[PDB]
Amino acid sequence: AEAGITGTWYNQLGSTFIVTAGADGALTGTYESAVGNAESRYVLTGRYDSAPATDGSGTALGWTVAWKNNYRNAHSATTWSGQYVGGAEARINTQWLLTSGTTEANAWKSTLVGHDTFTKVKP
Amino acid sequence: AEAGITGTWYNQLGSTFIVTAGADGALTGTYESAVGNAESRYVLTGRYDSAPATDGSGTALGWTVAWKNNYRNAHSATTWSGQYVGGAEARINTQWLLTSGTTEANAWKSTLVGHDTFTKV
Protein backbone atom coordinates (compact mmCIF):
# COMPACT_ATOMS: atom_id res chain seq x y z
CA ALA A 1 0.00 0.00 0.00
CA GLU A 2 1.44 3.42 -0.94
CA ALA A 3 1.24 5.06 2.49
CA GLY A 4 3.83 2.79 4.18
CA ILE A 5 6.47 3.36 1.48
CA THR A 6 6.10 7.15 1.54
CA GLY A 7 8.67 8.83 3.84
CA THR A 8 12.33 9.44 4.60
CA TRP A 9 14.58 6.30 4.58
CA TYR A 10 18.35 5.63 5.12
CA ASN A 11 20.83 2.91 4.27
CA GLN A 12 23.87 1.42 6.01
CA LEU A 13 26.36 3.89 4.36
CA GLY A 14 24.30 6.99 5.41
CA SER A 15 22.61 8.01 2.10
CA THR A 16 19.10 9.60 2.22
CA PHE A 17 16.17 8.76 -0.05
CA ILE A 18 12.83 10.82 0.12
CA VAL A 19 9.92 9.18 -1.77
CA THR A 20 6.14 9.71 -2.39
CA ALA A 21 4.08 6.70 -3.58
CA GLY A 22 1.22 7.83 -5.94
CA ALA A 23 -2.02 5.75 -6.16
CA ASP A 24 -1.45 4.54 -9.74
CA GLY A 25 1.93 2.81 -8.99
CA ALA A 26 4.37 5.84 -9.38
CA LEU A 27 7.42 6.76 -7.26
CA THR A 28 9.15 10.24 -7.32
CA GLY A 29 11.48 11.97 -4.88
CA THR A 30 15.17 12.78 -4.41
CA TYR A 31 18.38 10.89 -3.48
CA GLU A 32 21.32 12.30 -1.40
CA SER A 33 24.70 10.88 -0.10
CA ALA A 34 25.76 11.34 3.65
CA VAL A 35 27.61 14.59 3.07
CA GLY A 36 24.04 15.83 3.09
CA ASN A 37 23.33 19.32 1.86
CA ALA A 38 21.69 20.42 -1.35
CA GLU A 39 24.11 18.93 -3.82
CA SER A 40 24.22 15.55 -3.53
CA ARG A 41 20.44 15.82 -4.26
CA TYR A 42 19.44 14.04 -7.47
CA VAL A 43 15.94 13.28 -9.01
CA LEU A 44 14.64 9.69 -8.83
CA THR A 45 11.67 8.10 -10.66
CA GLY A 46 10.30 4.53 -10.12
CA ARG A 47 7.22 2.14 -9.91
CA TYR A 48 5.85 -0.28 -7.28
CA ASP A 49 3.09 -2.94 -6.99
CA SER A 50 0.05 -0.86 -5.89
CA ALA A 51 -2.00 -4.11 -5.21
CA PRO A 52 0.37 -6.42 -3.19
CA ALA A 53 -0.45 -10.10 -2.38
CA THR A 54 -1.75 -10.47 1.21
CA ASP A 55 0.27 -13.18 3.17
CA GLY A 56 3.48 -11.82 4.74
CA SER A 57 4.76 -11.22 1.22
CA GLY A 58 6.76 -8.04 0.49
CA THR A 59 5.85 -5.38 -2.10
CA ALA A 60 8.07 -5.42 -5.19
CA LEU A 61 9.46 -2.01 -6.33
CA GLY A 62 12.34 -0.45 -8.27
CA TRP A 63 13.75 3.04 -9.17
CA THR A 64 16.49 4.86 -11.21
CA VAL A 65 18.82 7.84 -10.41
CA ALA A 66 20.99 9.37 -13.28
CA TRP A 67 23.94 11.09 -11.58
CA LYS A 68 23.58 14.52 -13.18
CA ASN A 69 22.25 17.62 -11.33
CA ASN A 70 22.89 21.39 -11.67
CA TYR A 71 26.34 21.16 -9.95
CA ARG A 72 27.82 17.78 -11.05
CA ASN A 73 27.65 15.10 -13.78
CA ALA A 74 29.08 11.61 -13.06
CA HIS A 75 27.96 10.18 -16.50
CA SER A 76 26.28 7.15 -14.84
CA ALA A 77 22.90 5.72 -13.70
CA THR A 78 22.07 3.37 -10.76
CA THR A 79 18.91 1.11 -10.67
CA TRP A 80 17.79 -0.49 -7.31
CA SER A 81 15.38 -3.52 -7.53
CA GLY A 82 13.93 -5.05 -4.26
CA GLN A 83 11.00 -5.41 -1.85
CA TYR A 84 9.32 -3.46 0.88
CA VAL A 85 8.66 -5.52 4.00
CA GLY A 86 6.46 -3.49 6.31
CA GLY A 87 5.93 -4.01 10.03
CA ALA A 88 7.13 -2.12 13.12
CA GLU A 89 10.63 -1.98 11.65
CA ALA A 90 9.71 -1.26 8.02
CA ARG A 91 12.60 -2.18 5.62
CA ILE A 92 13.37 -1.95 1.91
CA ASN A 93 15.91 -4.63 0.93
CA THR A 94 17.53 -4.16 -2.51
CA GLN A 95 20.19 -5.20 -4.98
CA TRP A 96 21.55 -2.50 -7.34
CA LEU A 97 23.42 -2.11 -10.65
CA LEU A 98 25.56 1.10 -11.36
CA THR A 99 26.36 1.50 -15.19
CA SER A 100 28.97 4.17 -16.40
CA GLY A 101 29.11 5.50 -20.02
CA THR A 102 32.27 3.90 -21.64
CA THR A 103 33.94 3.53 -25.05
CA GLU A 104 33.16 0.22 -26.98
CA ALA A 105 36.53 -1.14 -25.92
CA ASN A 106 35.84 -0.77 -22.14
CA ALA A 107 32.27 -1.90 -22.15
CA TRP A 108 33.02 -5.28 -20.49
CA LYS A 109 33.82 -3.50 -17.17
CA SER A 110 31.04 -0.82 -17.22
CA THR A 111 28.69 -2.20 -14.50
CA LEU A 112 29.03 -2.60 -10.71
CA VAL A 113 26.62 -4.72 -8.52
CA GLY A 114 25.89 -4.56 -4.82
CA HIS A 115 23.08 -4.45 -2.27
CA ASP A 116 21.50 -1.95 0.20
CA THR A 117 19.14 -2.05 3.21
CA PHE A 118 16.97 0.99 4.00
CA THR A 119 15.43 1.72 7.46
CA LYS A 120 12.50 4.17 7.62
CA VAL A 121 12.57 7.26 9.85
CA LYS A 122 9.62 9.63 9.00
CA PRO A 123 6.77 9.86 6.46
CA ALA B 1 26.37 -33.73 -24.38
CA GLU B 2 28.52 -34.41 -21.21
CA ALA B 3 32.18 -34.86 -22.32
CA GLY B 4 31.76 -32.40 -25.27
CA ILE B 5 32.86 -29.82 -22.64
CA THR B 6 36.45 -31.09 -22.92
CA GLY B 7 38.20 -28.98 -25.60
CA THR B 8 39.30 -25.40 -26.50
CA TRP B 9 36.79 -22.51 -26.22
CA TYR B 10 36.94 -18.80 -27.21
CA ASN B 11 34.70 -15.95 -25.89
CA GLN B 12 33.50 -12.93 -27.90
CA LEU B 13 36.63 -10.80 -27.02
CA GLY B 14 39.32 -13.42 -28.00
CA SER B 15 40.06 -14.92 -24.53
CA THR B 16 40.83 -18.70 -24.63
CA PHE B 17 39.63 -21.35 -22.14
CA ILE B 18 41.10 -24.96 -22.35
CA VAL B 19 39.31 -27.56 -20.16
CA THR B 20 39.35 -31.20 -19.08
CA ALA B 21 36.07 -32.52 -17.61
CA GLY B 22 36.53 -35.56 -15.19
CA ALA B 23 33.86 -38.35 -15.15
CA ASP B 24 32.75 -37.48 -11.63
CA GLY B 25 32.21 -33.73 -12.01
CA ALA B 26 35.58 -31.91 -11.88
CA LEU B 27 36.65 -29.19 -14.30
CA THR B 28 40.38 -28.38 -14.67
CA GLY B 29 42.43 -26.31 -17.13
CA THR B 30 43.88 -22.92 -18.08
CA TYR B 31 42.50 -19.44 -19.16
CA GLU B 32 44.40 -16.81 -21.09
CA SER B 33 43.45 -13.30 -22.43
CA ALA B 34 43.79 -12.05 -26.06
CA VAL B 35 47.29 -10.75 -27.24
CA GLY B 36 48.08 -14.54 -26.91
CA ASN B 37 51.46 -14.23 -25.15
CA ALA B 38 52.45 -17.29 -23.16
CA GLU B 39 51.56 -15.81 -19.78
CA SER B 40 48.38 -14.24 -19.89
CA ARG B 41 47.61 -17.88 -18.64
CA TYR B 42 46.17 -18.62 -15.30
CA VAL B 43 44.87 -21.82 -13.60
CA LEU B 44 41.13 -22.59 -13.26
CA THR B 45 39.27 -25.19 -11.24
CA GLY B 46 35.47 -25.80 -11.26
CA ARG B 47 32.57 -28.34 -11.05
CA TYR B 48 29.71 -29.38 -13.44
CA ASP B 49 26.64 -31.74 -13.36
CA SER B 50 28.02 -35.19 -14.45
CA ALA B 51 24.53 -36.76 -14.69
CA PRO B 52 22.35 -34.11 -16.48
CA ALA B 53 18.61 -34.41 -17.20
CA THR B 54 17.12 -36.26 -20.18
CA ASP B 55 14.79 -33.55 -21.44
CA GLY B 56 16.59 -31.09 -23.80
CA SER B 57 18.08 -29.15 -20.78
CA GLY B 58 21.64 -27.78 -20.70
CA THR B 59 24.39 -28.94 -18.34
CA ALA B 60 24.93 -26.60 -15.32
CA LEU B 61 28.59 -25.66 -14.60
CA GLY B 62 30.92 -23.05 -13.01
CA TRP B 63 34.66 -22.22 -12.41
CA THR B 64 37.03 -19.69 -10.68
CA VAL B 65 40.30 -17.92 -11.80
CA ALA B 66 42.32 -15.99 -9.21
CA TRP B 67 44.32 -13.50 -11.24
CA LYS B 68 47.82 -14.38 -10.14
CA ASN B 69 50.51 -16.39 -11.93
CA ASN B 70 54.37 -16.00 -11.95
CA TYR B 71 54.39 -12.56 -13.58
CA ARG B 72 51.31 -10.64 -12.43
CA ASN B 73 48.97 -10.39 -9.45
CA ALA B 74 45.88 -8.26 -10.00
CA HIS B 75 44.48 -8.95 -6.45
CA SER B 76 41.13 -10.15 -7.82
CA ALA B 77 39.15 -13.33 -8.82
CA THR B 78 36.33 -14.07 -11.36
CA THR B 79 33.62 -16.80 -11.17
CA TRP B 80 31.53 -17.80 -14.21
CA SER B 81 28.18 -19.66 -13.60
CA GLY B 82 26.22 -20.94 -16.61
CA GLN B 83 25.33 -23.88 -18.83
CA TYR B 84 26.59 -25.99 -21.72
CA VAL B 85 24.51 -26.82 -24.78
CA GLY B 86 25.69 -29.25 -27.38
CA GLY B 87 24.62 -29.88 -30.90
CA ALA B 88 26.35 -29.08 -34.18
CA GLU B 89 26.99 -25.55 -32.75
CA ALA B 90 27.99 -26.17 -29.13
CA ARG B 91 28.29 -23.23 -26.72
CA ILE B 92 28.55 -22.29 -23.07
CA ASN B 93 26.41 -19.32 -21.97
CA THR B 94 27.59 -17.52 -18.79
CA GLN B 95 27.39 -14.56 -16.44
CA TRP B 96 30.37 -13.62 -14.15
CA LEU B 97 31.32 -11.69 -10.97
CA LEU B 98 34.83 -10.03 -10.72
CA THR B 99 35.72 -9.10 -7.07
CA SER B 100 38.87 -7.06 -6.21
CA GLY B 101 40.51 -7.04 -2.74
CA THR B 102 39.63 -3.53 -1.37
CA THR B 103 39.95 -1.55 1.89
CA GLU B 104 36.63 -1.39 3.87
CA ALA B 105 35.82 2.15 2.60
CA ASN B 106 35.76 1.00 -0.97
CA ALA B 107 34.02 -2.31 -0.29
CA TRP B 108 30.69 -1.05 -1.83
CA LYS B 109 32.32 -0.68 -5.27
CA SER B 110 34.33 -3.99 -5.14
CA THR B 111 32.40 -6.22 -7.67
CA LEU B 112 31.76 -5.99 -11.48
CA VAL B 113 29.07 -8.16 -13.28
CA GLY B 114 29.02 -9.18 -17.03
CA HIS B 115 28.21 -12.05 -19.50
CA ASP B 116 30.31 -14.22 -21.98
CA THR B 117 29.40 -16.75 -24.64
CA PHE B 118 32.07 -19.29 -25.46
CA THR B 119 32.19 -21.32 -28.71
CA LYS B 120 34.79 -23.61 -30.33
CA VAL B 121 35.19 -21.16 -33.25
Binding site: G14, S15, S33, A34, Y42, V65, W67, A74, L98 | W108
Partner: peptide
Protein backbone atom coordinates in the same frame (compact mmCIF):
# COMPACT_ATOMS: atom_id res chain seq x y z
CA UNK C 1 34.76 8.79 -6.23
CA UNK C 2 31.08 8.25 -7.09
CA UNK C 3 28.08 10.28 -5.67
CA UNK C 4 26.14 7.09 -4.89
CA UNK C 5 27.99 6.55 -1.62
CA UNK C 6 30.75 7.93 0.54
Amino acid sequence: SHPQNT
